Design an enzyme around this catalytic site. Structure first.
Site, PDB file in Angstrom:
ATOM      1  N   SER A 135       0.795  -1.238   0.000  1.00  0.00           N
ATOM      2  CA  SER A 135       0.000   0.000   0.000  1.00  0.00           C
ATOM      3  C   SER A 135       0.820   1.278   0.000  1.00  0.00           C
ATOM      4  CB  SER A 135      -0.983   0.099   1.218  1.00  0.00           C
ATOM      5  OG  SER A 135      -0.208   0.268   2.396  1.00  0.00           O
ATOM      6  N   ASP A 308      -2.546   7.654  11.283  1.00  0.00           N
ATOM      7  CA  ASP A 308      -2.339   6.463  10.442  1.00  0.00           C
ATOM      8  C   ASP A 308      -0.832   6.205  10.349  1.00  0.00           C
ATOM      9  OD1 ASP A 308      -2.165   4.816   7.983  1.00  0.00           O
ATOM     10  OD2 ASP A 308      -4.342   5.118   7.877  1.00  0.00           O
ATOM     11  N   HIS A 310       0.698   4.670   8.022  1.00  0.00           N
ATOM     12  CA  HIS A 310       1.228   4.741   6.657  1.00  0.00           C
ATOM     13  C   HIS A 310       1.982   6.053   6.499  1.00  0.00           C
ATOM     14  CE1 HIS A 310      -1.802   1.622   5.784  1.00  0.00           C
ATOM     15  NE2 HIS A 310      -1.017   1.301   4.765  1.00  0.00           N
TER      16      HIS A 310
END
Length: 335
Positions: A135, A308, A310
Site C-alpha cells: 500500500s 495512520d 502509513h
C-alpha cells in the site's frame, strides 16, 4: 460550424501510462493506481464516459497547469466533464487513477471533444520504471485529513514516492502494488491470497479470471521491488522460505525483462528488528541471485502520524529524495 469528435479510450490519440485492459468495445479498464491517460486537443469542451465497478474509485483530472480536481466515480456510467471554456484553444488533459484494485476498477469508454480535433498523443519519456510493492507504493493515506475516517479519497498516486521518483528521473512509471499483500503472505497471516508474484502477472484484479498482463507491453529499464511490510506483520517469516521465494521471484523478473536493472528495498514502514531482518534477507537474496543486474537501495523508516502509520505526504516526498540519488548511481542516470 460547431462539430464534435468522439474517440474510443483505446484510440491512438489517447496516451496511456500504466496497466490497462482493452475491452471489445475499445474501452479501457484499469485497477492499479497511477494509471495515467492523456490527450492534447483543440477545442472548447471535452467530456469522458466513465464508470467504476463499486462506485468507490477516485481519479484526478488535470487541465493544462491548473490545480487537479479529484472526482469519485459512480458505479453507473456517467458523463464526466474534463474541461469547458467559452472559446476553443489548445488544452492538455490528464486523468490519473488515484485508487487501487480493491477499491474497484475504473473504465473509460470514450471521449467527446467539442472543437476541431484531437492533436497527436502526448509523448512520454524514454526511461521506464516499474515499482512493485504494497500500500505504500499504492499511495495509501497520502491525502488523509485529521478528523476523517479513512476512506478511498485518502489515496494519492501522483504524490506517492514511486511517482515523485519517476518524475525526478524523467521516466515513465507503472505501479504494480496491492495493499495488505506480501511476497509470501498478507498482513493477517493468510498465505493463499494473490501474493506479489501472483498479482504481478495480472493486468488488473486478482481472481481466477484476472486478465494476464503481456510484459511486451511495458519493458522497464528499472524495476524497484519494495515488498515486505505485510510479510513481517505477523512476525518475522522463516528465513530460508522467504529468501528462496524472493530469489525465485527476482529470477522471474530478470527473465521477463532481460534489459532491466532490479533494485530491492525493504520499504519505509518496517522498523527495528523487522527492518533489519528484511535487509538481511535482501542481502542474502542478492547473494543467491549472483546477478550483476540486481542491487540494493537503503532507506529510512517513516513513522506516519497519529492518525495512520502509513507514511504521510511529506514522508513520501522524503522517500523520493532518499531513493532518487541512489537510483541515479545504480542506473547511471546522473541527469
Amino acid at each position: 460550424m460547431s462539430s464534435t469528435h468522439t474517440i474510443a479510450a483505446s484510440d491512438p490519440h489517447i496516451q496511456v501510462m500504466g496497466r490497462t485492459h482493452i475491452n471489445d468495445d475499445a474501452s479501457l479498464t484499469f485497477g492499479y493506481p497511477g494509471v495515467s491517460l492523456s490527450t492534447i486537443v483543440a477545442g472548447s469542451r471535452l467530456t469522458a464516459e466513465m464508470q467504476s465497478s463499486n462506485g468507490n474509485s477516485w481519479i484526478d483530472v488535470i487541465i493544462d497547469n491548473h490545480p487537479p480536481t479529484s472526482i469519485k466515480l459512480d458505479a453507473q456510467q456517467q458523463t464526466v466533464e474534463l474541461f469547458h471554456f467559452p472559446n476553443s484553444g489548445e488544452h492538455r488533459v490528464e486523468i490519473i487513477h488515484r485508487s487501487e484494485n480493491w477499491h474497484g476498477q475504473v473504465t473509460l469508454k470514450q471521449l467527446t471533444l467539442t472543437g476541431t480535433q484531437f492533436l497527436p498523443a502526448p509523448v512520454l519519456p524514454q526511461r521506464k520504471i516499474l515499482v512493485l510493492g504494497d500500500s505504500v507504493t499504492c499511495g495509501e493515506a497520502i491525502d488523509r485529513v485529521a478528523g476523517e475516517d479513512k476512506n478511498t479519497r485518502w489515496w494519492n498516486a501522483r504524490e506517492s514516492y514511486g511517482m515523485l521518483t519517476a518524475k525526478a528521473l524523467d521516466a515513465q512509471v507503472q505501479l504494480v502494488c496491492w495493499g495488505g499483500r506480501g511476497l509470501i503472505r498478507s498482513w493477517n497471516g493468510k498465505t493463499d491470497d494473490a501474493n506479489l508474484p501472483d498479482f504481478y502477472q495480472f493486468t488488473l484484479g486478482d481472481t481466477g479470471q484476472a486478465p494476464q498482463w503481456d510484459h511486451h507491453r511495458y519493458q522497464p529499464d528499472l524495476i524497484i521491488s519494495a515488498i515486505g511490510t505485510n510479510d513481517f506483520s505477523p512476525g518475522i517469516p522463516d528465513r530460508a522460505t522467504y529468501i528462496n521465494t524472493y530469489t525465485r521471484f527476482v529470477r522471474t523478473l530478470l527473465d521477463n525483462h532481460p534489459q532491466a536493472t532490479i533494485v530491492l528495498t525493504e520499504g519505509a514502514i518496517l522498523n527495528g528488528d523487522k527492518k533489519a531482518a528484511l535487509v538481511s534477507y535482501i542481502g542474502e537474496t542478492r547473494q543467491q541471485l549472483h546477478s550483476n543486474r540486481v542491487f540494493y537501495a537503503s532507506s529510512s523508516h517513516h513513522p506516519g502520524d497519529n492518525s495512520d502509520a502509513h507514511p504521510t505526504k511529506d514522508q513520501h516526498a522524503a522517500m523520493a529524495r532518499e531513493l532518487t540519488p541512489q537510483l541515479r548511481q545504480i542506473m547511471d542516470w546522473l541527469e
